[PDB]
Design an enzyme around this catalytic site. Structure first.
Site, PDB file in Angstrom:
ATOM      1  N   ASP A 166      11.067   9.951  43.520  1.00  7.76           N
ATOM      2  CA  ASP A 166      11.628  10.122  44.852  1.00  7.76           C
ATOM      3  C   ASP A 166      10.667  10.847  45.773  1.00  7.76           C
ATOM      4  OD1 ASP A 166      14.129   8.852  44.405  1.00  7.76           O
ATOM      5  OD2 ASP A 166      14.783  10.619  43.273  1.00  7.76           O
TER       6      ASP A 166
ATOM      7  N   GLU B 111      10.801   7.544  48.109  1.00  7.56           N
ATOM      8  CA  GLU B 111      12.063   6.834  47.934  1.00  7.56           C
ATOM      9  C   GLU B 111      12.434   5.854  49.050  1.00  7.56           C
ATOM     10  OE1 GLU B 111      13.771   6.009  45.593  1.00  7.56           O
ATOM     11  OE2 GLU B 111      15.400   5.120  46.757  1.00  7.56           O
TER      12      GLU B 111
HETATM   13  O1  LIG Z   1      22.972   6.501  42.265  1.00  5.17           O
HETATM   14  C1  LIG Z   1      22.155   5.882  42.942  1.00  5.17           C
HETATM   15  C2  LIG Z   1      20.792   6.072  42.763  1.00  5.17           C
HETATM   16  C3  LIG Z   1      19.866   5.373  43.532  1.00  5.17           C
HETATM   17  C4  LIG Z   1      18.493   5.565  43.349  1.00  5.17           C
HETATM   18  C5  LIG Z   1      17.573   4.855  44.123  1.00  5.17           C
HETATM   19  C6  LIG Z   1      16.849   3.970  43.320  1.00  5.17           C
HETATM   20  C7  LIG Z   1      15.583   4.326  42.861  1.00  5.17           C
HETATM   21  C8  LIG Z   1      14.848   3.458  42.060  1.00  5.17           C
HETATM   22  C9  LIG Z   1      15.385   2.223  41.717  1.00  5.17           C
HETATM   23  C10 LIG Z   1      16.649   1.862  42.174  1.00  5.17           C
HETATM   24  C11 LIG Z   1      17.382   2.731  42.975  1.00  5.17           C
HETATM   25 CL1  LIG Z   1      18.956   2.252  43.531  1.00  5.17          CL
HETATM   26  C12 LIG Z   1      18.041   6.468  42.392  1.00  5.17           C
HETATM   27  C13 LIG Z   1      18.963   7.162  41.627  1.00  5.17           C
HETATM   28  N1  LIG Z   1      18.599   8.034  40.703  1.00  5.17           N
HETATM   29  O2  LIG Z   1      17.284   8.226  40.505  1.00  5.17           O
HETATM   30  O3  LIG Z   1      19.567   8.690  39.983  1.00  5.17           O
HETATM   31  C14 LIG Z   1      20.318   6.965  41.818  1.00  5.17           C
HETATM   32  O4  LIG Z   1      21.207   7.657  41.058  1.00  5.17           O
HETATM   33 MN   LIG Z   2      14.125   6.775  42.837  1.00  5.78          MN
END
Ligand SMILES: O=Cc1cc(Cc2ccccc2Cl)cc([N+](=O)[O-])c1O
Ligand SMILES: [Mn+2]
Ligand SMILES: O=Cc1cc(Cc2ccccc2Cl)cc([N+](=O)[O-])c1O
Length: 181
Positions: free
Chosen positions: A93, A65
């Site tokens: 992640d 991530e």
């Molecule tokens: O809420 C923010 C957020 C940011 C991320 C980070 C992120 C991961 C991949 C692409 C864009 C972004 Cl902002 C991931 C998630 N998620 O998997 O639910 C999120 O909810």
């Molecule tokens: Mn992500």
């Protein structure tokens, strides 16, 4: 009642590294953190949760991530060739070297079951493990496998609770809680 700035809160509450990675994430997604402040906060939160998750069992997880997309994709590719895991559509992640699977973390102001369903549907992967935290202590994981012991997840939950209480004491909590899309 005094009403604070969310951006201020983020820069005071989150680690400068985290804030920077969030900043770059907002950069490369074409959104202004000065307008979408709740989103800045949410991305910072997600980042900190992923980092705490990894930190809960060092040398077990690979962090996908934190990195910039291109680096993260090289890392994913490497993991795939080395282990034999299915390559994901999305940047996950984490990678779990113990359970041999990618992990997608979610943090939500909404109801965790619905959020889990939306997340799962949004990633279209039967191999990726999904772990959802809320700010209220509720959680939801793939096949009831919560990966980490109660203590670690309690550390995460405590952090979330603290973020929420500090948001609320600054009057920031309501707008944040309701601005989730
Ligand atoms: O809420 C923010 C957020 C940011 C991320 C980070 C992120 C991961 C991949 C692409 C864009 C972004 Cl902002 C991931 C998630 N998620 O998997 O639910 C999120 O909810
Ligand atoms: Mn992500
Ligand atoms: O809610 C899921 C979610 C996922 C992400 C990451 C993401 C963004 C686009 C496509 C897939 C994925 Cl996993 C980001 C955000 N966000 O910035 O609010 C999200 O809310």
């Amino acid at each position: 009642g005094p009403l604070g700035s969310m951006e201020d809160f983020v820069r005071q509450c989150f680690n400068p590294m985290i804030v920077e990675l969030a900043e770059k994430t907002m950069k490369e997604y074409g959104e202004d953190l000065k307008i979408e402040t709740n989103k800045f906060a949410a991305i910072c939160t997600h980042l900190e949760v992923c980092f705490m998750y990894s930190d809960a069992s060092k040398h077990r997880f690979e962090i996908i991530e934190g990195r910039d997309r291109t680096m993260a994709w090289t890392v994913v590719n490497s993991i795939c060739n080395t282990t034999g895991a299915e390559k994901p559509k999305f940047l996950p992640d984490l990678y779990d070297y113990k359970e041999n699977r990618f992990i997608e973390i979610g943090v939500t102001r909404r109801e965790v079951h619905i959020y889990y369903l939306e997340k799962a549907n949004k990633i279209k992967s039967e191999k990726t493990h999904i772990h959802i935290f809320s700010f209220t202590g509720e959680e939801m994981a793939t096949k009831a496998d919560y990966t980490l012991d109660e203590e670690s997840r309690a550390r995460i939950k405590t952090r979330l609770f603290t973020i929420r209480q500090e948001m609320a004491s600054r009057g920031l909590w309501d707008s944040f809680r309701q601005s989730e899309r």
